[PDB]
Amino acid sequence: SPGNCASCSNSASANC
Amino acid sequence: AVKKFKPYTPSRRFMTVADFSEITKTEPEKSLVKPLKKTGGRNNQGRITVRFRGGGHKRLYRIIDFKRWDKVGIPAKVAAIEYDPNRSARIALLHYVDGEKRYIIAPDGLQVGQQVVAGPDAPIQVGNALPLRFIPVGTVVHAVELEPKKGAKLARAAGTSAQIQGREGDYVILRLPSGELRKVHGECYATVGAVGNADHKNIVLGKAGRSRWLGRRPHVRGAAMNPVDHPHGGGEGRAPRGRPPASPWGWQTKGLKTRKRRKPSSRFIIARRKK
Amino acid sequence: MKRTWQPNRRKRAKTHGFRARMRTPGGRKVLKRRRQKGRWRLTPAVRK
RNA sequence: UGGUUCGUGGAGCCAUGGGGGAAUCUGGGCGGACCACCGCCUAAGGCUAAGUACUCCGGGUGACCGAUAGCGCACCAGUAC
RNA sequence: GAGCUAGCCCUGGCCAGGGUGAAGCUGGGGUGAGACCCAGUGGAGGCCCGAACCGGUGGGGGAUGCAAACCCCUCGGAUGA
RNA sequence: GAAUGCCGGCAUGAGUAACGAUAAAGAGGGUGAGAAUCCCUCUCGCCGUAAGCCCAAGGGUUCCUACGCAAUGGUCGUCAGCGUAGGGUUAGGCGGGACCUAAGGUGAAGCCGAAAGGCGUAGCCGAAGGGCAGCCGGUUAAUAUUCCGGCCCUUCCCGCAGGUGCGAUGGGGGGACGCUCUAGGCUAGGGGGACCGGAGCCAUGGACGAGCCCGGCCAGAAGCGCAGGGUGGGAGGUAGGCAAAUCCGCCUCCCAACAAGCUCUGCGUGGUGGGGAAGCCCGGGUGACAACCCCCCGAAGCCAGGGAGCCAAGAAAAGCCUCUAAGCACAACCUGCGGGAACCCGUACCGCAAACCGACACAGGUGGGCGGGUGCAAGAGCACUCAGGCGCGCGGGAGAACCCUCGCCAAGGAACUCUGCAAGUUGGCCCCGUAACUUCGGGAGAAGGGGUGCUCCCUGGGGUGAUGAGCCCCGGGGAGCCGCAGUGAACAGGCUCUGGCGACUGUUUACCAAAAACACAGCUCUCUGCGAACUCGUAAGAGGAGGUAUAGGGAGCGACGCUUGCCCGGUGCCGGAAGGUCAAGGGGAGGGGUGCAAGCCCCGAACCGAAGCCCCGGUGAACGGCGGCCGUAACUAUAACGGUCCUAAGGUAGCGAAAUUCCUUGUCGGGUAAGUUCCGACCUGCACGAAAAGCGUAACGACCGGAGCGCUGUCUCGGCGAGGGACCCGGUGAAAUUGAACUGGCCGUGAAGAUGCGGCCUACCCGUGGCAGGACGAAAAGACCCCGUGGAGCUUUACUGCAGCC
RNA sequence: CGAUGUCGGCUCGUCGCAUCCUGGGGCUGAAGAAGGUCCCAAGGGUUGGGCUGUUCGCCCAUUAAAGCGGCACGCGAGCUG
RNA sequence: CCGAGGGUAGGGCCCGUGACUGGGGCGAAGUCGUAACAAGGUAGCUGUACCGGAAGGUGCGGCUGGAU
RNA sequence: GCGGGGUGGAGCAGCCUGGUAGCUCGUCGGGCUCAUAACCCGAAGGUCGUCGGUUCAAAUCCGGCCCCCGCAACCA
Ligand SMILES: [Mg+2]
Ligand SMILES: [Mg+2]
Ligand SMILES: [Mg+2]
Ligand SMILES: [Mg+2]
Ligand SMILES: [Mg+2]
Ligand SMILES: [Mg+2]
Ligand SMILES: [Mg+2]
Ligand SMILES: [Mg+2]
Ligand SMILES: [Mg+2]
Ligand SMILES: [Mg+2]
Ligand SMILES: [Mg+2]
Ligand SMILES: [Mg+2]
Ligand SMILES: [Mg+2]
Ligand SMILES: [Mg+2]
Ligand SMILES: [Mg+2]
Ligand SMILES: [Mg+2]
Ligand SMILES: [Mg+2]
Ligand SMILES: [Mg+2]
Ligand SMILES: [Mg+2]
Ligand SMILES: [Mg+2]
Ligand SMILES: [Mg+2]
Ligand SMILES: [Mg+2]
Ligand SMILES: [Mg+2]
Ligand SMILES: [Mg+2]
Ligand SMILES: [Mg+2]
Ligand SMILES: [Mg+2]
Ligand SMILES: [Mg+2]
Ligand SMILES: [Mg+2]
Ligand SMILES: [Mg+2]
Ligand SMILES: [Mg+2]
Ligand SMILES: [Mg+2]
Ligand SMILES: [Mg+2]
Ligand SMILES: [Mg+2]
Ligand SMILES: [Mg+2]
Ligand SMILES: [Mg+2]
Ligand SMILES: [Mg+2]
Ligand SMILES: [Mg+2]
Ligand SMILES: [Mg+2]
Ligand SMILES: [Mg+2]
Ligand SMILES: [Mg+2]
Ligand SMILES: [Mg+2]
Ligand SMILES: [Mg+2]
Ligand SMILES: [Mg+2]
Ligand SMILES: [Mg+2]
Ligand SMILES: [Mg+2]
Ligand SMILES: [Mg+2]
Ligand SMILES: [Mg+2]
Ligand SMILES: [Mg+2]
Ligand SMILES: [Mg+2]
Ligand SMILES: [Mg+2]
Ligand SMILES: [Mg+2]
Ligand SMILES: [Mg+2]
Ligand SMILES: [Mg+2]
Ligand SMILES: [Mg+2]
Ligand SMILES: [Mg+2]
Ligand SMILES: [Mg+2]
Ligand SMILES: [Mg+2]
Ligand SMILES: [Mg+2]
Ligand SMILES: [Mg+2]
Ligand SMILES: [Mg+2]
Ligand SMILES: [Mg+2]
Ligand SMILES: [Mg+2]
Ligand SMILES: [Mg+2]
Ligand SMILES: [Mg+2]
Ligand SMILES: [Mg+2]
Ligand SMILES: [Mg+2]
Ligand SMILES: [Mg+2]
Ligand SMILES: [Mg+2]
Ligand SMILES: [Mg+2]
Ligand SMILES: [Mg+2]
Ligand SMILES: [Mg+2]
Ligand SMILES: [Mg+2]
Ligand SMILES: [Mg+2]
Ligand SMILES: [Mg+2]
Ligand SMILES: [Mg+2]
Ligand SMILES: [Mg+2]
Ligand SMILES: [Mg+2]
Ligand SMILES: [Mg+2]
Ligand SMILES: [Mg+2]
Ligand SMILES: [Mg+2]
Ligand SMILES: [Mg+2]
Ligand SMILES: [Mg+2]
Ligand SMILES: [Mg+2]
Ligand SMILES: [Mg+2]
Ligand SMILES: [Mg+2]
Ligand SMILES: [Mg+2]
Ligand SMILES: [Mg+2]
Ligand SMILES: [Mg+2]
Ligand SMILES: [Mg+2]
Ligand SMILES: [Mg+2]
Ligand SMILES: [Mg+2]
Ligand SMILES: [Mg+2]
Ligand SMILES: [Mg+2]
Ligand SMILES: [Mg+2]
Ligand SMILES: [Mg+2]
Ligand SMILES: [Mg+2]
Ligand SMILES: [Mg+2]
Ligand SMILES: [Mg+2]
Ligand SMILES: [Mg+2]
Ligand SMILES: [Mg+2]
Ligand SMILES: [Mg+2]
Ligand SMILES: [Mg+2]
Ligand SMILES: [Mg+2]
Ligand SMILES: [Mg+2]
Ligand SMILES: [Mg+2]
Ligand SMILES: [Mg+2]
Ligand SMILES: [Mg+2]
Ligand SMILES: [Mg+2]
Ligand SMILES: [Mg+2]
Ligand SMILES: [Mg+2]
Ligand SMILES: [Mg+2]
Ligand SMILES: [Mg+2]
Ligand SMILES: [Mg+2]
Ligand SMILES: [Mg+2]
Ligand SMILES: [Mg+2]
Ligand SMILES: [Mg+2]
Ligand SMILES: [Mg+2]
Ligand SMILES: [Mg+2]
Ligand SMILES: [Mg+2]
Ligand SMILES: [Mg+2]
Ligand SMILES: [Mg+2]
Ligand SMILES: [Mg+2]
Ligand SMILES: [Mg+2]
Ligand SMILES: [Mg+2]
Ligand SMILES: [Mg+2]
Ligand SMILES: [Mg+2]
Ligand SMILES: [Mg+2]
Ligand SMILES: [Mg+2]
Ligand SMILES: [Mg+2]
Ligand SMILES: [Mg+2]
Ligand SMILES: [Mg+2]
Ligand SMILES: [Mg+2]
Ligand SMILES: [Mg+2]
Ligand SMILES: [Mg+2]
Ligand SMILES: [Mg+2]
Ligand SMILES: [Mg+2]
Ligand SMILES: [Mg+2]
Ligand SMILES: [Mg+2]
Ligand SMILES: [Mg+2]
Ligand SMILES: [Mg+2]
Ligand SMILES: [Mg+2]
Ligand SMILES: [Mg+2]
Ligand SMILES: [Mg+2]
Ligand SMILES: [Mg+2]
Ligand SMILES: [Mg+2]
Ligand SMILES: [Mg+2]
Ligand SMILES: [Mg+2]
Ligand SMILES: [Mg+2]
Ligand SMILES: [Mg+2]
Ligand SMILES: [Mg+2]
Ligand SMILES: [Mg+2]
Ligand SMILES: [Mg+2]
Ligand SMILES: [Mg+2]
Ligand SMILES: [Mg+2]
Ligand SMILES: [Mg+2]
Ligand SMILES: [Mg+2]
Ligand SMILES: [Mg+2]
Ligand SMILES: [Mg+2]
Ligand SMILES: [Mg+2]
Ligand SMILES: [Mg+2]
Ligand SMILES: [Mg+2]
Ligand SMILES: [Mg+2]
Ligand SMILES: [Mg+2]
Ligand SMILES: [Mg+2]
Ligand SMILES: [Mg+2]
Ligand SMILES: [Mg+2]
Ligand SMILES: [Mg+2]
Ligand SMILES: [Mg+2]
Ligand SMILES: [Mg+2]
Ligand SMILES: [Mg+2]
Ligand SMILES: [Mg+2]
Ligand SMILES: [Mg+2]
Ligand SMILES: [Mg+2]
Ligand SMILES: [Mg+2]
Ligand SMILES: [Mg+2]
Ligand SMILES: [Mg+2]
Ligand SMILES: [Mg+2]
Ligand SMILES: [Mg+2]
Ligand SMILES: [Mg+2]
Ligand SMILES: [Mg+2]
Ligand SMILES: [Mg+2]
Ligand SMILES: [Mg+2]
Ligand SMILES: [Mg+2]
Ligand SMILES: [Mg+2]
Ligand SMILES: [Mg+2]
Ligand SMILES: [Mg+2]
Ligand SMILES: [Mg+2]
Ligand SMILES: [Mg+2]
Ligand SMILES: [Mg+2]
Ligand SMILES: [Mg+2]
Ligand SMILES: [Mg+2]
Ligand SMILES: [Mg+2]
Ligand SMILES: [Mg+2]
Ligand SMILES: [Mg+2]
Ligand SMILES: [Mg+2]
Ligand SMILES: [Mg+2]
Ligand SMILES: [Mg+2]
Ligand SMILES: [Mg+2]
Ligand SMILES: [Mg+2]
Ligand SMILES: [Mg+2]
Ligand SMILES: [Mg+2]
Ligand SMILES: [Mg+2]
Ligand SMILES: [Mg+2]
Ligand SMILES: [Mg+2]
Ligand SMILES: [Mg+2]
Ligand SMILES: [Mg+2]
Ligand SMILES: [Mg+2]
Ligand SMILES: [Mg+2]
Ligand SMILES: [Mg+2]
Ligand SMILES: [Mg+2]
Ligand SMILES: [Mg+2]
Ligand SMILES: [Mg+2]
Ligand SMILES: [Mg+2]
Ligand SMILES: [Mg+2]
Ligand SMILES: [Mg+2]
Ligand SMILES: [Mg+2]
Ligand SMILES: [Mg+2]
Ligand SMILES: [Mg+2]
Ligand SMILES: [Mg+2]
Ligand SMILES: [Mg+2]
Ligand SMILES: [Mg+2]
Ligand SMILES: [Mg+2]
Ligand SMILES: [Mg+2]
Ligand SMILES: [Mg+2]
Ligand SMILES: [Mg+2]
Ligand SMILES: [Mg+2]
Ligand SMILES: [Mg+2]
Ligand SMILES: [Mg+2]
Ligand SMILES: [Mg+2]
Ligand SMILES: [Mg+2]
Ligand SMILES: [Mg+2]
Ligand SMILES: [Mg+2]
Ligand SMILES: [Mg+2]
Ligand SMILES: [Mg+2]
Ligand SMILES: [Mg+2]
Ligand SMILES: [Mg+2]
Ligand SMILES: [Mg+2]
Ligand SMILES: [Mg+2]
Ligand SMILES: [Mg+2]
Ligand SMILES: [Mg+2]
Ligand SMILES: [Mg+2]
Ligand SMILES: [Mg+2]
Ligand SMILES: [Mg+2]
Ligand SMILES: [Mg+2]
Ligand SMILES: [Mg+2]
Ligand SMILES: [Mg+2]
Ligand SMILES: [Mg+2]
Ligand SMILES: [Mg+2]
Ligand SMILES: [Mg+2]
Ligand SMILES: [Mg+2]
Ligand SMILES: [Mg+2]
Ligand SMILES: [Mg+2]
Ligand SMILES: [Mg+2]
Ligand SMILES: [Mg+2]
Ligand SMILES: [Mg+2]
Ligand SMILES: [Mg+2]
Ligand SMILES: [Mg+2]
Ligand SMILES: [Mg+2]
């Protein structure tokens, strides 16, 4: 998931 | 003789406890105890200055008589031998013919019911206290003052003893528990005999909880930390030291001597310790 | 879950109160500033 | 070592943390290492108005603002929150 | 700023019920005396099962939420570090 | 006119999502302008170790009553924790203060620091700990251990009587203590009664009954009784308890001991004072002259400072008692009795929550006590239910897709998939029975089975009582009865075989990782002789430790078993009174400036001159490192063997395609119909290897592999059903997003992926429910990557400083 | 680069034809049967399983056959991870 | 009721076989060294321990079945 | 992609600094021994991987080619 921290777009919820 | 346990839990496999054979009295002398201010390794700033301390059993401090020249000539009776949680030795309760009650630490072989006494004219007998100059050469001895009237400092832990090697002016030569050869002033008091509870060193704590009971909090290796924390910190995966092994504060910790070089007592240490 | 504000009347007065402020140099500068600004209360109110 | 324009510079002067340590005018300091000569001044005690600075306060005046401006506040604002 | 969190200090409190059955002790056997064996008693333990309590393993839901970390099912510890 | 500009206003999305636990509602009657929503009644459902009750914190009038409905309330509202107003909180005994100390804080003395300030003995402060005197009922719309009633008690002042060497911030005793287990006797609480009191009831086939339903107590001073706790008496000596001491301590002597005596609690009784149900009738009245009795169960509470065991060895101070010193013995103190005196603050209400902490009347968080009954082996578990409290502040219909939660399924049974993920299965108790291996404990609930309800008959032991009856608790045997099914509902393990890692129970990235990571007992090295080393601090001062080498610090390794080889050339550390280098300082050959000169001033060689470095040694569980090429045996192949180069020394034992093996799905064997995984082997180990430990290892594991049995909707392959939504109607009514829009398909073109340009094709205008291919859809000025003479953490034999140490 | 979500699987298709099968053919070193090779043909069809994240590949049991490619290595506002 | 035996589950013994692996016996003329028999050129043997391509070596203690 | 190397039969010096190829083993002849090995006395064998260049002169210095080990191949 994008999500966690290797990628960064399209893919998980709010955090920022 | 340590007491073993059957392997009915993983920890009971190896746990050993003292036999408590010599103990004859299981509550302290109310007039000789005061509360021990547990510190947790914190100083008056509130800062941890000795790591990994705290959380042990509650304790009462038993006042010990480390200057037995306080009562020269007045014999006492050994009334009991009791457990002291503030030290490895056992302590002995003394009833002086004075009516005064004091605690000394209990030498090996001291039998309840015997008399002890202190002074220049005392019999060379287990439990008596004399200035070092009056004890025969060859006598093993404990609770040795290091300077006259300053209090017993040497050979106090369970089973330890110093042995008198010879005399040299106002000084006797002692072999300390560490094997160091030192000159101690002859006027210094000492108690003939070794400290009791020699079997102390053969106790196997057996589990982690037993270290917790003693106030010893878990010690964490420098290798387990990060560079902000310790010279040995970091590395990708495990990692050898990668430098001369070091304390958290930078200084080397394998062999680096740390006694102050210009210390005035060097004139009195004959030969540094053995082994 | 347990949130960060856990009101305690004794803790509030002993930490931020008038007499805690006056005890230290930084505490007095707080009162000095809040007076100069015209603050209606120099110090948190707490029932006691 | 600091001060001065002076950052070790030919580095004096003024001050002083450490060491050594006088003299009372035929004594002492200074004039940019030092020396001579020629001058200037009297250290290691103290006080001293005025001319100078500021604007919480009062007043006078604006080729200052005019309610998103002018103080954060023209109004119950260092308030509500 | 340690009213969150982390450690420590002082002082209090809490841990249903059920299971296993160490040492010791007693009796019996054994022996020169012993070690030891058997039974009973006993009730040890970072022992076992399981609420409270403390957790947060797997899955599903939730995802402008009931909630800026929650809900359900399941799961770990539960006299101890 | 643009700054993802700032402030404000108003749009779009849209009458859309949503209206906050799926515990649930229906009718009747009231009130009112208006009622699903307020009040009352009946029926229904939900909690009941709470979703009931009582404290504490926090909150701060939210409490009670009257009058109100603009806003607040996710709808409505006549209602309300909302608006307005009036009312309401009563103490010598409850809590805190006028008492005591704990950590800590502060701090006459004293110490230290440029200033600010930091320490610090006594002392003072500091409590949910110690100490201290109130129990039951009644009363208000709202307070009550507070008011009232009954019955008790405390301290202070004064007085009287009797007694006594009185007297203290001083001495002593006591207060005063852990964990686990636990005796006897009580009480709280509870079950039963064919006994006692009670308004009634007879239904629908039977019952007028030893029937049903309701209740059968609470408090109490002296005394007494039962049960416990605490406590020896006397004398002589005395140098210790920093003065004194008749006290306490120590020695001796006589008497007394599982007693008794004395003293102190608990429980019972106790003069007395209260309470008192169902049902009926309108909170009240009746019942009622209410009765208030017997049996059983029985605490974790009480007697209590009880008993036993264990090691990890379990606050202080005051009250209280005793001793004496000044003093004073007209006093003073003690004891009894009498009169008087007794202050300040809190008290409403919420309190697992709509009133506290979370912006909300928020499915979250919040410490202590009470927490009834029945059945299920027990229990605070589970189901139902009492007292009490609730139906969760939008509703009404409908009966689509699809989603959520749930039930079932023919045949098959892991064929699903990264993976049996998920869900089945198993499931409690009693009995039978249980393997390798093992550290002899374990493995173990191994595995696997059988039993389980009801009725009758016979009978063994316990508790209470009496030894008996009754009640209650553990059982034993025999004969039967019913169903598909007897832990008939609910709560309640699937199992086995075999590897890897870690010994184990523990700990961790609050909020993506619980692990093989950390810790851990244990092992080793090393430092430290005590004003220790080390750590914090400018210091004083602390910690270390009121410890003393069987101790304390640092480091690695990580139960246990068997072990841990070779290299000291480099780095580190240790030892080394020589030698080499070496700064300030000493020394002063010899120069220089200036002056008529005495002199003043400046430079200055040899030489003496620390630590450090050089140098000489030691040292591996210190940092670390542990070869290459060529040849050789009577088949071949391979080399025990040899030659030579190099090194400080050339990897030993053990292990090995491994959590390490690149080539690689190595090769062979096992398991499968089939095996890139797995297990067992082999060894040309790209690139294991011995405390960054090597090889094993019983037990343990929500760790990670592989296999099998059981069973299944995982699947072939889907079907049906339930409820909450989605849908329709009434009420309330968001959101991100948005240059404007009159916003089609193909093939091309275009900054290279076009609704918007070209050519063609297609297309009447506007919606609703649906699906997600496009609008290079939304979100977040890409985390990857580069660039910036941008930043920050970290390292070191990078540079340069500083602390610290020499 | 003020974001054009990145392998594979699943689901859902659709297109190309350089055709794997099925239909029609010519040549054959085509006796028959069965093959070989080339031509026409895209209507429809193109299995289940073991291993591996795999795409691919190998293997088992079958089959008329077990085709090859494109569609942002088709398809994450469709799922998985 | 018992009951051949069938079925489920878990044990014990024997036999055969197994990638690979351990040593053993034997085999006309292989390779390395020379341990033992002479004091076998270090007297030998020995129980144990450790080491080494190999026979062996060395330690500790023992035997004479040891020469002179 | 960068680095080192190629010389009597084997394993290595010489290459840096141009003129001179050396060390151990092996091989050949002769001793010693009954004989073999060990041992002792003599001797032989290399145009320096190859081609091209600089130079008076190349193993040596510089290029190309052949070959042999070694290191590297990272961010996606
Ligand atoms: Mg994001
Ligand atoms: Mg043991
Ligand atoms: Mg044992
Ligand atoms: Mg065990
Ligand atoms: Mg003892
Ligand atoms: Mg005391
Ligand atoms: Mg201390
Ligand atoms: Mg302090
Ligand atoms: Mg420390
Ligand atoms: Mg500590
Ligand atoms: Mg002791
Ligand atoms: Mg000690
Ligand atoms: Mg001395
Ligand atoms: Mg030890
Ligand atoms: Mg302790
Ligand atoms: Mg330790
Ligand atoms: Mg550790
Ligand atoms: Mg680390
Ligand atoms: Mg780390
Ligand atoms: Mg830090
Ligand atoms: Mg750093
Ligand atoms: Mg560091
Ligand atoms: Mg490191
Ligand atoms: Mg690391
Ligand atoms: Mg590594
Ligand atoms: Mg290491
Ligand atoms: Mg290293
Ligand atoms: Mg270091
Ligand atoms: Mg140091
Ligand atoms: Mg020493
Ligand atoms: Mg928290
Ligand atoms: Mg907040
Ligand atoms: Mg709190
Ligand atoms: Mg408070
Ligand atoms: Mg408080
Ligand atoms: Mg507080
Ligand atoms: Mg404070
Ligand atoms: Mg304060
Ligand atoms: Mg100040
Ligand atoms: Mg004001
Ligand atoms: Mg303030
Ligand atoms: Mg200056
Ligand atoms: Mg100057
Ligand atoms: Mg000076
Ligand atoms: Mg004069
Ligand atoms: Mg003059
Ligand atoms: Mg004059
Ligand atoms: Mg002069
Ligand atoms: Mg001057
Ligand atoms: Mg001048
Ligand atoms: Mg002048
Ligand atoms: Mg003067
Ligand atoms: Mg002057
Ligand atoms: Mg305005
Ligand atoms: Mg405005
Ligand atoms: Mg304006
Ligand atoms: Mg103003
Ligand atoms: Mg403004
Ligand atoms: Mg205002
Ligand atoms: Mg707190
Ligand atoms: Mg518990
Ligand atoms: Mg059991
Ligand atoms: Mg038993
Ligand atoms: Mg016993
Ligand atoms: Mg346990
Ligand atoms: Mg169990
Ligand atoms: Mg167990
Ligand atoms: Mg969870
Ligand atoms: Mg699950
Ligand atoms: Mg979230
Ligand atoms: Mg659950
Ligand atoms: Mg458990
Ligand atoms: Mg513009
Ligand atoms: Mg802007
Ligand atoms: Mg704006
Ligand atoms: Mg704005
Ligand atoms: Mg705005
Ligand atoms: Mg406006
Ligand atoms: Mg608006
Ligand atoms: Mg509009
Ligand atoms: Mg609208
Ligand atoms: Mg819409
Ligand atoms: Mg919504
Ligand atoms: Mg909702
Ligand atoms: Mg609601
Ligand atoms: Mg619920
Ligand atoms: Mg539900
Ligand atoms: Mg109805
Ligand atoms: Mg209704
Ligand atoms: Mg209504
Ligand atoms: Mg209405
Ligand atoms: Mg109502
Ligand atoms: Mg009705
Ligand atoms: Mg509030
Ligand atoms: Mg309203
Ligand atoms: Mg309204
Ligand atoms: Mg109004
Ligand atoms: Mg509203
Ligand atoms: Mg709401
Ligand atoms: Mg009305
Ligand atoms: Mg009263
Ligand atoms: Mg008063
Ligand atoms: Mg205070
Ligand atoms: Mg106080
Ligand atoms: Mg108190
Ligand atoms: Mg009180
Ligand atoms: Mg009372
Ligand atoms: Mg009234
Ligand atoms: Mg006590
Ligand atoms: Mg005590
Ligand atoms: Mg206490
Ligand atoms: Mg009672
Ligand atoms: Mg009962
Ligand atoms: Mg006396
Ligand atoms: Mg009446
Ligand atoms: Mg309790
Ligand atoms: Mg008690
Ligand atoms: Mg006592
Ligand atoms: Mg214990
Ligand atoms: Mg105290
Ligand atoms: Mg008188
Ligand atoms: Mg008296
Ligand atoms: Mg007063
Ligand atoms: Mg009240
Ligand atoms: Mg709750
Ligand atoms: Mg409420
Ligand atoms: Mg609500
Ligand atoms: Mg009841
Ligand atoms: Mg049960
Ligand atoms: Mg309870
Ligand atoms: Mg409801
Ligand atoms: Mg609720
Ligand atoms: Mg419909
Ligand atoms: Mg069902
Ligand atoms: Mg059915
Ligand atoms: Mg089925
Ligand atoms: Mg199956
Ligand atoms: Mg099956
Ligand atoms: Mg499978
Ligand atoms: Mg499928
Ligand atoms: Mg079950
Ligand atoms: Mg077994
Ligand atoms: Mg087996
Ligand atoms: Mg097994
Ligand atoms: Mg095993
Ligand atoms: Mg066993
Ligand atoms: Mg056993
Ligand atoms: Mg069993
Ligand atoms: Mg097993
Ligand atoms: Mg039966
Ligand atoms: Mg029945
Ligand atoms: Mg279970
Ligand atoms: Mg681990
Ligand atoms: Mg573990
Ligand atoms: Mg292990
Ligand atoms: Mg461990
Ligand atoms: Mg545990
Ligand atoms: Mg986390
Ligand atoms: Mg947080
Ligand atoms: Mg976080
Ligand atoms: Mg966080
Ligand atoms: Mg875990
Ligand atoms: Mg960790
Ligand atoms: Mg660890
Ligand atoms: Mg170990
Ligand atoms: Mg420091
Ligand atoms: Mg101390
Ligand atoms: Mg073992
Ligand atoms: Mg073993
Ligand atoms: Mg070895
Ligand atoms: Mg070395
Ligand atoms: Mg060396
Ligand atoms: Mg070295
Ligand atoms: Mg190094
Ligand atoms: Mg030197
Ligand atoms: Mg190393
Ligand atoms: Mg290295
Ligand atoms: Mg090295
Ligand atoms: Mg051959
Ligand atoms: Mg070796
Ligand atoms: Mg291998
Ligand atoms: Mg391996
Ligand atoms: Mg490897
Ligand atoms: Mg491989
Ligand atoms: Mg591979
Ligand atoms: Mg294969
Ligand atoms: Mg093979
Ligand atoms: Mg191989
Ligand atoms: Mg490693
Ligand atoms: Mg585990
Ligand atoms: Mg685990
Ligand atoms: Mg399987
Ligand atoms: Mg399905
Ligand atoms: Mg439905
Ligand atoms: Mg309609
Ligand atoms: Mg509407
Ligand atoms: Mg509304
Ligand atoms: Mg437009
Ligand atoms: Mg338009
Ligand atoms: Mg359109
Ligand atoms: Mg269109
Ligand atoms: Mg193009
Ligand atoms: Mg186009
Ligand atoms: Mg168009
Ligand atoms: Mg055009
Ligand atoms: Mg056009
Ligand atoms: Mg068209
Ligand atoms: Mg619609
Ligand atoms: Mg629609
Ligand atoms: Mg779409
Ligand atoms: Mg889509
Ligand atoms: Mg799209
Ligand atoms: Mg775009
Ligand atoms: Mg798109
Ligand atoms: Mg920006
Ligand atoms: Mg950017
Ligand atoms: Mg960004
Ligand atoms: Mg990141
Ligand atoms: Mg990336
Ligand atoms: Mg780039
Ligand atoms: Mg640069
Ligand atoms: Mg630049
Ligand atoms: Mg930069
Ligand atoms: Mg500095
Ligand atoms: Mg981009
Ligand atoms: Mg954007
Ligand atoms: Mg974007
Ligand atoms: Mg032919
Ligand atoms: Mg076709
Ligand atoms: Mg087609
Ligand atoms: Mg692909
Ligand atoms: Mg492949
Ligand atoms: Mg293959
Ligand atoms: Mg065919
Ligand atoms: Mg394709
Ligand atoms: Mg394409
Ligand atoms: Mg491609
Ligand atoms: Mg590609
Ligand atoms: Mg793709
Ligand atoms: Mg996705
Ligand atoms: Mg995908
Ligand atoms: Mg998308
Ligand atoms: Mg899209
Ligand atoms: Mg993932
Ligand atoms: Mg049969
Ligand atoms: Mg042969
Ligand atoms: Mg021989
Ligand atoms: Mg020989
Ligand atoms: Mg020999
Ligand atoms: Mg040897
Ligand atoms: Mg050579
Ligand atoms: Mg060379
Ligand atoms: Mg040359
Ligand atoms: Mg030669
Ligand atoms: Mg040439
Ligand atoms: Mg040439
Ligand atoms: Mg990257
Ligand atoms: Mg990188």
From Swiss-Prot, chain B:
Q: Where is the signal peptide?
A: none
Region (Disordered) residue ranges read 222-275
InterPro entries the record matches: NA-bd_OB-fold, Rib_uL2_dom2, Ribosomal_uL2, Ribosomal_uL2_bac/org-type, Ribosomal_uL2_C, Ribosomal_uL2_CS, Ribosomal_uL2_dom3, Ribosomal_uL2_RNA-bd_dom
A Pfam match is Ribosomal_L2
Protein purpose:
One of the primary rRNA binding proteins. Required for association of the 30S and 50S subunits to form the 70S ribosome, for tRNA binding and peptide bond formation. It has been suggested to have peptidyltransferase activity; this is somewhat controversial. Makes several contacts with the 16S rRNA (forming bridge B7b) in the 70S ribosome.
**The protein's assembly and partners:** Part of the 50S ribosomal subunit. Forms a bridge to the 30S subunit in the 70S ribosome, contacting the 16S rRNA. May also make transient contacts with protein S6 during translation in the 70S ribosome.
How is this protein named in the record? Answer: Large ribosomal subunit protein uL2
Say which species the protein is native to: Thermus thermophilus (strain ATCC 27634 / DSM 579 / HB8)
Q: Which gene encodes it?
A: rplB
UniProtKB/Swiss-Prot annotation, chain C:
Question: What Gene3D superfamilies does its record include?
Answer: 1.10.287.3980
One GO CC term on file:
ribonucleoprotein complex
Ordered alphabetically, the record's keywords are: Ribonucleoprotein, Ribosomal protein
Q: Where is the composition biased (Basic residues)?
A: 29-48
InterPro entries annotated for this entry?
Ribosomal_bL34, Ribosomal_bL34_CS
Region Disordered: which residues? 26-48
A GO molecular-function descriptor: structural constituent of ribosome
At the top level, the lineage of the source is Bacteria
A single Pfam family, by name? Ribosomal_L34
Please name the GO terms of the biological process aspect recorded for this protein, alphabetically. translation
Q: What else is known?
A: The open reading frame (ORF) for this protein is entirely within the ORF for the RNase P protein (RnaP). The two start codons are separated by four nucleotides.
Describe its assembly: Part of the 50S ribosomal subunit.
Q: What does this protein do?
A: Found on the solvent side of the large subunit.
Family as reported in the entry's similarity comment: Belongs to the bacterial ribosomal protein bL34 family.
Protein name in the entry: Large ribosomal subunit protein bL34
Q: What organism is the protein native to?
A: Thermus thermophilus (strain ATCC 27634 / DSM 579 / HB8)
What taxonomic ancestry is recorded? Bacteria, Thermotogati, Deinococcota, Deinococci, Thermales
Gene label: rpmH
